[PDB]
Amino acid sequence: APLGPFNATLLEQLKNDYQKGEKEVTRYIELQEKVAEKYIKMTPLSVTAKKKLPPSKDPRDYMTLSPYWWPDSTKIDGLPYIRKDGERNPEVYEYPERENANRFGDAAYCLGVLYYITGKEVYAKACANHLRTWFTDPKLGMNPNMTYAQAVPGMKKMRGSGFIDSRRFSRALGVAKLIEGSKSWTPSDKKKLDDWATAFCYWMENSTQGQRESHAANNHGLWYEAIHLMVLAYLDRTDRIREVAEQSILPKMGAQIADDGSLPQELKRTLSLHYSTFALEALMEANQITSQIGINLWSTPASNGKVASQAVDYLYPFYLNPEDWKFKQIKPFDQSRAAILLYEAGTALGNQKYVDTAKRIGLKYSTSDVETIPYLVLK
Amino acid sequence: SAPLGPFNATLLEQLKNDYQKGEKEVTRYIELQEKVAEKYIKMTPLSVTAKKKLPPSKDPRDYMTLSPYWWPDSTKIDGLPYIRKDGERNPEVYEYPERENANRFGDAAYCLGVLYYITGKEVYAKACANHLRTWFTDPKLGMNPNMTYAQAVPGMKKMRGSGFIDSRRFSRALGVAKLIEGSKSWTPSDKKKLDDWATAFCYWMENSTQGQRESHAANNHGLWYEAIHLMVLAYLDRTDRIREVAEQSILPKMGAQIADDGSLPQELKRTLSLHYSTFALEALMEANQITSQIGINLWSTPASNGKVASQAVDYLYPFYLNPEDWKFKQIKPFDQSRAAILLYEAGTALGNQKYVDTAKRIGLKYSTSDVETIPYLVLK
């Protein structure tokens, strides 16, 4: 499989078995095709489909509201907003790109994978429609930046915390590699997309906000690097992947994993079992890329000897029994997120206790969650 | 004496008195409220018709929302039929503009209606009336007098009436419309049209299959149904019906829902049981604001099975002091502030000074812009 943001081992195996005619996978892939049909009929989304404009007055600028920041009732205009960690302000849904980057990202990702597996041009044609409109179109494509992501009304300074929104459309960026070579993805489509990705990469690395986010001390810094690897893997910059893992990702695990394997930065959140998992999910998606060039982030130590497997170890008992979690978790923790996480980390580590638990937790065979497409092995 | 309506008439009367006499504490406070009210004067009137996705009638004047706990089923190709995840609000609810729009309308009109009553400034009635006409009676923008498509569920075959509970967001604004009666802005024609709307909405709620079902409900829906029923009935001046609904419906329903220890078993089986216990009593609290203005005290009047609503406050009072001691399922944190208005209302009604003191101790923020707190200077 081409370098991209997915378990390439599971993807190749599915492509093999579908091409060999194996009945189980063929049944499973045909189910996926029935699910994928809405993405073929779906109209391409754009970040420009919004009424309230960013300070730039450019509808091509991505803007969302930071989810935990609420109008302050004791102020006449409600400004400046105030933070309530863990409580999502429904005002976020007044920004169309919040949900639309998920919908677009889901649409293009599923179509791109099904194209890789089946070789059917109808899926590349659909994926390319979504990729053109979201990214590169001279009127509908988003500008390559995240200046106004997770804005906070009344905040004086500019922050880089919104960059984490980028994960919703950056996985679709990588999956564009899978439709290269289809008749629908022309040389011109690739060059424009390459050019956008290069420009988005520059912004990530050189803007003040991108820089700040690259230094974040919690799961934001990890997710920044996972997004970075998707952009770099798309651009086929393998040495930069190697440098990012050794000079940024591993120091970050080494600093954020404590001697007992907990993640202290996530423990102090109101959703500490969710955010502990969310940090490891950054590592999981980064590792899907690093391991394709021979770097295993689960077992490779940071310079102080810490290994990300220690963090899974710490959480594994609570994945068996979430009610035992002793830190603040003001909403129920969805145990299903542990399945893919424990399967990814289990196989990387040869830890069958982890792999066994992933299958027991399992995923619903017929679910349409697109991130679960590769994991027949769990279904 | 304040017109009959959905508010603590004692507090409102007190505020108007002190404001007119010129007392400083009240005049300063009303001057804060007038500053908060200024956005509602500039605010453009909302209409339920401002939606892209239409209801099965293809009529945009029909109110429609999604039942907040029903999610697409991922294991089905179309997601249908939706499945319930109690307590977890599906963000799809926000694709129905009237969900939040009825809140914005109701706050704006209530605040304007109260401020006109307290201060007598015509600019408040004129703004209130603009919102009332546009939401209720306007022949193009006014909502149809029904709640057929409230909290619909995609793929569900039966028709449900549980969505009727949404009516509380605009029905208090209906009640406050009485306060601007007599202004120059609220003409006889405005009042007649609104009377006709309210009469027709009352007919719908009492005779439609969904209204009948909802009137029979055994949990907080039945209480909220009757609390809403009272606001429409009080708006219409049918005081004999208010007596009958209080006597034959709210109290029997209240008594059947209170257990021997004072707990509310119907709310205890919910994933947000301390929220839903409080939500049940808030229905009675708001209905009592109407019944007690005609001499029926729902906090202290026992039902015929012997249960009395003060028993349910007793069961919940300790957990209002210390919400973390709550032993039943509560999958989101409980807002202790909701206890402030609740305990003062039931406290003053019951002569329970321990309840009134805790209300003031928990309190409300003096400068808050939450419109439901306008009458409660005493808590600020």
Ligand SMILES: O=C(O)[C@@H]1O[C@@H](O[C@H]2[C@H](O)[C@H](O)[C@H](O[C@H]3[C@H](O)[C@H](O)[C@H](O[C@H]4[C@H](O)[C@H](O)[C@H](O)O[C@H]4C(=O)O)O[C@H]3C(=O)O)O[C@H]2C(=O)O)[C@@H](O)[C@@H](O)[C@@H]1O
């Ligand atoms: O998009 C979502 O809705 C949501 O995203 C994921 O959670 C994200 C949030 O989007 C949000 O960015 C939040 O950021 C937190 C976080 O703690 C962050 O480090 C920063 O903290 C600030 C803050 O002012 C603190 O008071 C402190 O001083 O630290 C600051 C700092 O600079 O570090 O900002 C806050 C905030 O703005 O509330 O949490 C994010 C995260 O931690 O990943 C996630 O829940 C995802 O599942 C969901 O989809």
Ligand SMILES: O=C(O)[C@@H]1O[C@@H](O[C@H]2[C@H](O)[C@H](O)[C@H](O[C@H]3[C@H](O)[C@H](O)[C@H](O[C@H]4[C@H](O)[C@H](O)[C@H](O)O[C@H]4C(=O)O)O[C@H]3C(=O)O)O[C@H]2C(=O)O)[C@@H](O)[C@@H](O)[C@@H]1O
């Ligand atoms: O709009 C909000 O977000 C929210 O509204 C208030 O909560 C309401 C909900 O809007 C919703 O209607 C929910 O209703 C429950 C409830 O349990 C109800 O009685 C009925 O339950 C049915 C259902 O079929 C059950 O599965 C069971 O068999 O019992 C039935 C019964 O009739 O008893 O409908 C369900 C449902 O469909 O989810 O809860 C409401 C409530 O309890 O009042 C409220 O939380 C408010 O603060 C908030 O604004």
